[PDB]
């Protein structure tokens, strides 16, 4: 019954496409047409963190908006003091091929994972006065692409085996597995309520998952190549994705479709990282051109450019207070913009 | 007070910097190698007191287009070749012409020369106008029946390698051994140093 099942699957996709087209009465650009432009945005490199040896794949801001962790392929996990540029921790990793890092939203733990297929949890606040591997989460059959703490005892990880997993750090077991992607899940972002999360994979598709139930709610397909980056809007009702097709796109959870595309003819490089500002008015995206573009989220205009890195911009983040933007790059430097 | 604890924060940074210098020594003195044919296996060997660290991917899916970008600042990629041959020809084409792998050298091991001697003309109906290049040296005592096939396979890989001048990468074909990787990494680093001085 392969033909019939494929025949049914192509009658539901057209039903979904017709349903989405019915709700598309006026575009986002038509509604924010009569809004004041953001204007030219000048951000300057306020800090430059110069400790890492190899290229940097990931960084993650602390909830206090002062400390941040960064992961580099030399086999190091450095925790920075963004205000004083002082290194607080330098954590050597068992495997040097690390592709992601997360910072617990309590300052207590940091996570990292890579080609070793393991998410390693590191305890920072222990009476022993040193950072040790709190846990090693094994069970993914592909490299770890992203990880985000839900609390001190829950962490969600995306893998290069086309699955996302929810873990119980105390027991070191997968509480839930999220399947349905056909390519390598490259990134994930948690909703502000940590009840949902979106993930983008190497199939030009983004999926909205329910953390508690373990099921997919919605699938978003607007891109043409692999989705490298994903991030929720601050409101939680929308998210933005960056892909290899040199475009960033904004999706709406309630409208279940696309709102805006953030692209220009001069960009033919893929987006590696995306993030919003505190109000969601600016969308910051890193590119393979070694530069980060600032976009007017409601206007799709390029508000500004962060152009201080000598190599591919790999990671990018905005503090919880919105005071600064930190970008990492393959030139082994972290720069803070404000 | 802030001053008293800022001394401790500067002291903690200073201890890290002293260790990060010891880590920098071993990082630059180590030659990383991607052996391409747990989620990754590491092989430790040293030749003439030079540390080589060779990484073989393990539990990874056959879609390499993402995790292979982690191996661009590697010293060389060890490519082992046993239509299986055209599949390895297309994979070497991908690595050679990659945006991020166009500065990475490829040490190419054309393996299975012992079974190749035991037994290709159907997969490549151009291996009928090809004759052993006398510019290269054959192995004495062996008929030109298998050396013609050995050099034909090498010339298919050298057709790819020589077509792209976009990057600072060199291909090193071989016939299958530990010293060959050492000698070729010696040539890779020298060619890189000679390029900083504009001598090459």
């Amino acid at each position: 019954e392969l033909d019939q099942l494929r025949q049914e699957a192509e009658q539901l996709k057209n039903q979904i496409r017709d349903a989405r087209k019915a709700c598309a009465d006026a575009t986002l650009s038509q509604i924010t047409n009569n809004i004041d432009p953001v204007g030219r945005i000048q951000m300057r490199t306020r800090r430059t963190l110069r400790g890492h040896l190899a290229k940097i794949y990931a960084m993650h801001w602390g909830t206090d908006s002062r400390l941040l962790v960064s992961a580099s392929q030399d086999g190091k996990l450095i925790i920075w003091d963004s205000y004083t540029t002082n290194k607080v921790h330098a954590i050597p990793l068992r495997s040097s091929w690390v592709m992601t890092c997360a910072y617990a939203p309590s300052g207590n733990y940091v996570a990292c994972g890579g080609l070793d297929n393991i998410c390693s949890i590191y305890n920072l606040k222990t009476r022993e006065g040193n950072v040790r591997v709190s846990r090693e989460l094994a069970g993914h059959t592909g490299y770890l692409s992203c990880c985000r703490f839900l609390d001190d005892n829950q962490i969600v990880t995306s893998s290069g085996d086309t699955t996302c997993a929810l873990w119980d750090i105390e027991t070191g077991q997968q509480t839930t597995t999220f399947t349905g992607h056909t390519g390598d899940v490259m990134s994930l972002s948690l909703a502000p309520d940590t009840r949902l999360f979106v993930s983008g994979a190497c199939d030009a598709s983004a999926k909205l998952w329910d953390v508690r139930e373990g099921m997919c709610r919605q699938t978003f397909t607007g891109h043409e190549s692999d989705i490298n980056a994903i991030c929720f809007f601050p409101n939680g009702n929308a998210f933005a994705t960056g892909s290899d097709d040199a475009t960033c796109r904004l999706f709406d959870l309630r409208a279940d479709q696309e709102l805006m595309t953030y692209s220009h003819d001069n960009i033919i490089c893929g987006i590696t990282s995306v993030s919003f500002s505190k109000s969601g008015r600016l969308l910051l995206a890193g590119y393979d051109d070694f530069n980060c573009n600032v976009w007017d989220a409601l206007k799709a205009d390029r508000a500004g450019v962060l152009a201080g890195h000598d190599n591919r911009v790999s990671c990018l983040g905005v503090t919880d207070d919105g005071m600064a933007v930190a970008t990492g790059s393959w030139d082994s430097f972290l720069k803070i913009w404000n | 007070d802030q001053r008293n604890e800022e001394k401790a924060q500067r002291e903690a940074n200073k201890k890290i910097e002293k260790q990060l210098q010891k880590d920098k020594q071993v990082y630059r003195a180590t030659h990383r190698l991607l052996l391409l044919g747990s989620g990754i296996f590491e092989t430790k060997f040293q030749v003439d007191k030079v540390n080589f660290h060779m990484f073989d991917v393990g539990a990874q899916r056959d879609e390499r287009r993402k995790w292979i970008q982690c191996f661009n600042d590697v010293t060389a990629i060890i490519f082992v070749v046993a239509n299986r041959l055209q599949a390895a020809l297309k994979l070497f084409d991908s690595i050679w012409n990659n945006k991020w792998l166009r500065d990475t050298s490829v040490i190419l091991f054309l393996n299975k020369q012992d079974l190749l001697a035991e037994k290709i003309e159907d997969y490549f109906p151009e291996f009928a106008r090809y004759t052993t290049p006398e510019d290269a040296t054959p192995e004495p005592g062996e008929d030109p029946r298998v050396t013609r096939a050995k050099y034909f396979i090498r010339d298919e890989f050298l057709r790819i390698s020589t077509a792209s001048g976009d990057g600072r990468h060199y291909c090193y074909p071989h016939f299958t051994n530990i010293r060959r990787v050492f000698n070729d990494c010696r040539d890779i680093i020298q060619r890189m140093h000679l390029r900083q001085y504009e001598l090459l």
């Epitope: 199939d203 043409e224 | 287009r65 599949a87 991908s94 945006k99």
Partner: nanobody, 126 residues
């Protein structure tokens, strides 16, 4: 979304002509290298031919070189494979595969694991 649908194929006597068409949608056709791959019964996916973004750099696998012809209509968003003198070894499911990224001379698209930018395939019996 990125959709690749192949047409043509079926039973043909040893020899004869069989033309494959690949209708593409969900992406800008002219920005990608396009590939042809097949999976013979009892064998894995095998690369057959490719054609560049413009149609200048055309490549084939040796076993079919001189018999098959690949061509793309960038205006019509369609890919072709004119197969001439079909041998019985050419019996396979032929997949129209798109290279993962645009403006790239690089492709990783013969993986048995689900490659997103590959089509459904069409049976070709010789």
């Amino acid at each position: 979304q990125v959709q690749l649908q192949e047409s043509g194929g079926g039973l043909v006597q040893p020899g004869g002509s069989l033309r494959l068409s690949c209708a593409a949608s969900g992406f800008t056709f002219s920005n990608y290298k396009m590939n042809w791959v097949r999976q013979a019964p009892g064998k894995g996916l095998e690369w057959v031919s490719d054609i560049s973004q413009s149609g200048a750099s055309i490549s084939y696998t040796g076993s079919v070189k001189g018999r098959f012809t690949i061509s793309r209509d960038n205006a019509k968003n369609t890919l072709y494979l004119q197969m001439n003198s079909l041998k019985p070894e050419d019996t396979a499911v032929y997949y129209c595969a798109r290279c993962p990224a645009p403006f790239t001379r690089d492709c990783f698209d013969v993986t048995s694991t689900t490659y997103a930018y590959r089509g459904q395939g069409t049976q070709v019996t010789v």
